Symmetry: D3
Subunit: 151 residues, 6 copies
């Protein structure tokens, strides 16, 4: 259970507004383990694949353009219930509903510029991880505080 | 909609306990735009006008004296749903009910020393803004990150 | 009422992961007064007394070993509703249910390594205080900001 | 001597990059007392007065345009040796020479976008104070921690 | 050499202005190990012993009264060159000369309210440690990141 | 001049001690632009190339083993004088000499576990960038605050 992983991506507005370090620190101080990280401008084709479920929504063309309009930080994090807990830490998808203390609650305002993405389930995490990273980009190491984080 | 404004005042206890910077930083990092700001000791007459709706409450004389007992920082902030979101960020009026992560939940304890004020509605914001500021004190400028905060 | 006290202990995992300063800062910034503090490795006998109600639970031997496996910071804090508010600040006993903004929600993952303890009631605070501190270790002084924190 | 005052202005780049709360917090946590504060777009004529000594420098037209290109936060701060210490806290005028730990050393890069101004001497502070504030904007109150800051 | 220790005391002004958490966090994040900690009001006799070398200085009566005027946090910290490094982190004894980034440079103003004490040499550390703590209050444990801090 | 780049690597001790977010935030808040980033366990052969100049030093086998003993965060950052400024922000190579306010001064103790690397010159930056990154990993975009950071 402690080996669960999620995909977290800082979107272009999070990069542009200078929020990368603050976001990583939230995951680090919680006790989760950084498995993978890269910085890139995601191609339109890649983003169409990421967002394939939405390909018919009216806002899809604009979503893909915005997500391609600057670089993103793509990450994988590991730990117990990291998918669900990761989502709690992000806050609600819509920042208007996100509580103070959460990433979106603290740092952004509108649903179209909501700074971050996290996997919504284990099954979507495994799909997003295979889409965004090569197997060799997932680094295997053990946190020095593992036994103080986990029974 | 993105042009809504609220009035936020740091009460004398907020000033005295050295919380001005911390409070401003919360609004800045969220993406709201500072429109106006001044520091003053509000007269008793001014405060009776600010609090006119409470003039019959038992606590009103003591409320006015406390609000006159040191300086306050008066501000106007702008953004989408700034009134309602501003109140969420402050926390509940009574600090005992305010959640961790909010301004009152993090920083104060009792309802009579609750460090900050925010407008409860658009209509009361517009009245409080006209009471506390001259129209020329409201500054018009565009945040450099506006297009990363709003679609 | 403003003289209520609670017992807070930073558990060995809290110490080990470098969270002592962060935790104390949360209580200080809120307006509570530090009454007593010591750093020690609690003996097994002491811990069995602290946790006497659980002496029959399956996890009790392991709980005691963990709580003896490094030092703890034992504190007393004072203020209005410090017991209940202290527990809100800590978050739920189980970190999986603790909200962002709380100590456990921000800093830990698993119920067996949940970094901190706070008294659950006035009556249990008074018992824990007499167990962990001598009366002469409780310091009486008045915070310089007391009249800005309390009516 | 403990009554000395300085003028500090957060320049339009400081406001645009969201540094107002961070800067104020540095002065507050040091133990200085905020005496006055306002937020305005300074007129070109006002700025030419502020910068009268430089009116012949090649960079003066550009300096005045930049200082008028967005709002500034104008402040007065009080305490022992606040002029000299204020300058130390800001860092060197040229951010390339400012040490880490200082405001310019932490937050900016180039001399023409150096985020903040502080009075260079007691006599220039008193001139800048009279230029930017009316005497009634200077608030008299005593910090609750004064006797823990000063012998 | 990695087993060197220093005595650090947060003075009454440091406690009263709510700096305890901040100060501890500086030592923890650096990689030093907390060995002992207690909170007390030091007696005048104890303080006269601590400050015996200064008993003839004109400021001595004032120094002793102030150091007795509220509680102090007494600590022992361990690590390589902790005495010298500890002093660098504190800053110069006189806050006017302390650089931004240091404890005194960031948080206090005058030499008689200079928030913190650190041992000036290994020999004075060992004397201060035996004066303020019993040998049994010094806790022996190994930090989980020790081998990431030391070769 | 404003297009200069440096290579910054957070070493395995920096990762293990949970300093990645904190370090990135220092570069972001200064005004530098993140150009590239990846997370990997560098091979022994790669590290021997990075450290080719030291291959005869007594500490070289241990340095390579330590640098291979966990993952590193490799980055490229851009801005005016980023190589020299980068070095000033890191502090001296030897943490014993690094000032408070710097990354090494704040966060580490010993030369063999000094948490971070930065290029010592433009020429070594260009060599390190070509060794650690492919050209296509270097992302070109323009900061939204560019004209508030640079004249
Ligand atoms: C913000 C989102 F990226 C979500 O992060 C993602 C997943 O769609 P959902 O929100 O249904 O689901 P999750 O948040 O994953 O639980 O689509 C986007 N999105 C959703 N609604 C809207 C909308 O009105 N406008 C725009 N511009 N983007 C929208
Ligand atoms: C503290 C307040 F200034 C509130 O900030 C404001 C509006 O508080 P309300 O409850 O009317 O409504 P809102 O939540 O603002 O919409 O009155 C005051 N106030 C309310 N109860 C008390 C009380 O017991 N003691 C005192 N000293 N002041 C009180
Ligand atoms: C974490 C706890 F110390 C609680 O902090 C304390 C009192 O927990 P209680 O159930 O008495 O109630 P509170 O919510 O505290 O008032 O026992 C422990 N504890 C409870 N369940 C478990 C468990 O599964 N595993 C382990 N290792 N420890 C557990
Ligand atoms: C940056 C400043 F706004 C300083 O804040 C102010 C006082 O800087 P001065 O050198 O006059 O003197 P002090 O540091 O106070 O002793 O002038 C400006 N300034 C100085 N050099 C330059 C320059 O090259 N380019 C530009 N654009 N502006 C410059
Ligand atoms: C602040 C100090 F506690 C120093 O920490 C310690 C020894 O001061 P020294 O500088 O001799 O030695 P250190 O560098 O400190 O180790 O007495 C105090 N002290 C020094 N000067 C003064 C002064 O003017 N006024 C007052 N009120 N107290 C002073
Ligand atoms: C810390 C370093 F990685 C420096 O980054 C790099 C170049 O050390 P240099 O001083 O040649 O140059 P820089 O200051 O780096 O640009 O060697 C390493 N290093 C230097 N001395 C020692 C030492 O005693 N022990 C160990 N374990 N490693 C050492």
């Amino acid at each position: 259970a402690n080996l669960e992983r999620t995909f977290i991506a800082i979107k272009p507005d999070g990069v542009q507004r200078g929020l990368v370090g603050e976001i990583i620190k939230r995951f680090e101080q919680k006790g989760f383990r950084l498995v993978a990280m890269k910085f890139l401008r995601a191609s339109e084709e890649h983003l169409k694949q990421h967002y394939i479920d939405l390909k018919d929504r009216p806002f899809f063309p604009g979503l893909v353009k915005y997500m391609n309009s600057g670089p993103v930080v793509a990450m994988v994090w590991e730990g117990l219930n990291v998918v669900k807990t990761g989502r709690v830490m992000l806050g609600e998808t819509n920042p208007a509903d996100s509580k103070p203390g959460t990433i979106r609650g603290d740092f952004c305002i509108q649903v179209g510029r909501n700074i971050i993405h996290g996997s919504d389930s284990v099954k979507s995490a495994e799909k997003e991880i295979s889409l965004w990273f090569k197997p060799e980009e997932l680094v295997d190491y053990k946190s020095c505080a593992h036994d103080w984080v986990y029974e």
